[PDB]
Amino acid sequence: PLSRFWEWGKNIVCVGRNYADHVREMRSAVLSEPVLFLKPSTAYAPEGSPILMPAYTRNLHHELELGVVMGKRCRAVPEAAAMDYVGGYALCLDMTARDVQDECKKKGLPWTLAKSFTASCPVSAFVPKEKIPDPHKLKLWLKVNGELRQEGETSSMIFSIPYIISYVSKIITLEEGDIILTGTPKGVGPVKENDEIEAGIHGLVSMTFKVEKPEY
Amino acid sequence: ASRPLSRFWEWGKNIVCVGRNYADHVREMRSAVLSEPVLFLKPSTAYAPEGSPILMPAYTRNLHHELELGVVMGKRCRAVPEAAAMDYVGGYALCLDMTARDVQDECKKKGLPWTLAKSFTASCPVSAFVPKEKIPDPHKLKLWLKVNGELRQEGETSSMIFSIPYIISYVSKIITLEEGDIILTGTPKGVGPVKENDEIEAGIHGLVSMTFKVEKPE
Numbered sequence A: 001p002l003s004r005f006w007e008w009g010k011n012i013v014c015v016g017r018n019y020a021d022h023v024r025e026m027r028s029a030v031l032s033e034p035v036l037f038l039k040p041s042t043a044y045a046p047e048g049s050p051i052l053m054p055a056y057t058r059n060l061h062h063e064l065e066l067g068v069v070m071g072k073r074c075r076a077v078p079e080a081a082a083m084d085y086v087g088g089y090a091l092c093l094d095m096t097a098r099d100v101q102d103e104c105k106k107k108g109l110p111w112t113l114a115k116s117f118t119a120s121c122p123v124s125a126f127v128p129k130e131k132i133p134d135p136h137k138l139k140l141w142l143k144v145n146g147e148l149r150q151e152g153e154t155s156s157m158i159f160s161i162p163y164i165i166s167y168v169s170k171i172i173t174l175e176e177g178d179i180i181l182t183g184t185p186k187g188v189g190p191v192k193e194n195d196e197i198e199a200g201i202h203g204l205v206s207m208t209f210k211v212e213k214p215e216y
Numbered sequence B: 001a002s003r004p005l006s007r008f009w010e011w012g013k014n015i016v017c018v019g020r021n022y023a024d025h026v027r028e029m030r031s032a033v034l035s036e037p038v039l040f041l042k043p044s045t046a047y048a049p050e051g052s053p054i055l056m057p058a059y060t061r062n063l064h065h066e067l068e069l070g071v072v073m074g075k076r077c078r079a080v081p082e083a084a085a086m087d088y089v090g091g092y093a094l095c096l097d098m099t100a101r102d103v104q105d106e107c108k109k110k111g112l113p114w115t116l117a118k119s120f121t122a123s124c125p126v127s128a129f130v131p132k133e134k135i136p137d138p139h140k141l142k143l144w145l146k147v148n149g150e151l152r153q154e155g156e157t158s159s160m161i162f163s164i165p166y167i168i169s170y171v172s173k174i175i176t177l178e179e180g181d182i183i184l185t186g187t188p189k190g191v192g193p194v195k196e197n198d199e200i201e202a203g204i205h206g207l208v209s210m211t212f213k214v215e216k217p218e
């Protein structure tokens, strides 16, 4: 079932630079097409699993994002058909080792250690598509230890969800249960061991995660 | 329930790739080896088993072949020591890390992800599964690759800068590996372009071979 998509889904695709105010806080520039990177299936941390800090970062950031879960195999589809391939949604955190990412960008290296480590994708319960007639009218929020740190409106996305789906599908075929993370609004920032993150989509879902270090 | 490793590309979730693992490839790229292997990812839909085409992306004019040994995981592998790492291997496959090299040069220059260069649909042509029992030492293999009958790449897995047990241990500490995940262990020298309708043949001497046609989609 899609209600447990993180258990069997193979691929995670992430969009970068999709909120103008996040682009500004990063001091980057918006390109003509969305930036894409990948996370492995073992990046998923469903509720009840910890956010795990990698030992090689001293600057682990939260990033609040809407995930789009695919309901059917999606290969090179037009924008106008792209929503037909969506099964539903989930709220994700694109946990990011920001210090590692800065080095990767500077040296022209892959973004893997910065973005694609174990438990780098905390994920909410699945929200069926029927509950979200317009994914560009959602409000996202995130708290650390009870204090609000990120909020965003999906109406602020530079690239629309039907564009993202179509764009990704032409580069990488998407299977049933693959997710696309659609980028973070402004307000990214560090977390430390034992922080409690609470996050949600207003009116639809919330989730709580503890930041931990590996006990192995 | 469980599915056979003989068809790992059909159900396996993740592809992890090592960069800069053969000194003579590093030289031809004019790069440098770091203290640790470079890692990048491919999606499950990068897999092109025999009988499927290599698909050229529309956005490249310089699609390169890269000949690599793949290590297929047989058991869930989380943060394991080097000395235990081979216990987690199920077997092997020969892969091509198809690379849009023009796109990769731009990505490096702009500090962007290597995704469009490395991680597109059909970017991982893959041989038949070779069970671990047939390869007691994966660092004593000879790899070869032909384009239209002409030899273009050959390599010896003894030349790997980082060993397979090191790579598995290193990767497992960063990214937990599931049963049926593959690790591509890097290319020897001789990478080069292919064009539409080229025939690629490749093999591990004495163990496996495979043939792929280069096509454009639909």
Ligand SMILES: O=C([O-])C(=O)[O-]
Binding pocket: A014, A015, A016, A017, A018, A019, A022, A035, A063, A094, A182, A183, A184
């Ligand atoms: O680059 C990113 O990850 C983003 O914009 O969310």
Ligand SMILES: O=C([O-])C(=O)[O-]
Binding pocket: B018, B019, B020, B021, B022, B025, B066, B097, B185, B186, B187
């Ligand atoms: O960087 C690479 O792809 C390699 O060395 O195989």
Ligand SMILES: [Cl-]
Binding pocket: A037, A038, A109, A110, A111, A112, B040, B041, B112, B113, B114, B115
């Ligand atoms: Cl990358």
Ligand SMILES: [Mg+2]
Binding pocket: A010, A011, A012, A039, A040, A041, B013, B014, B015, B042, B043, B044
């Ligand atoms: Mg995957």
Ligand SMILES: [Mg+2]
Binding pocket: A014, A015, A016, A063, A065, A094, A183, A184
């Ligand atoms: Mg992000």
Ligand SMILES: [Mg+2]
Binding pocket: B017, B018, B019, B066, B068, B097, B186, B187
């Ligand atoms: Mg390679």
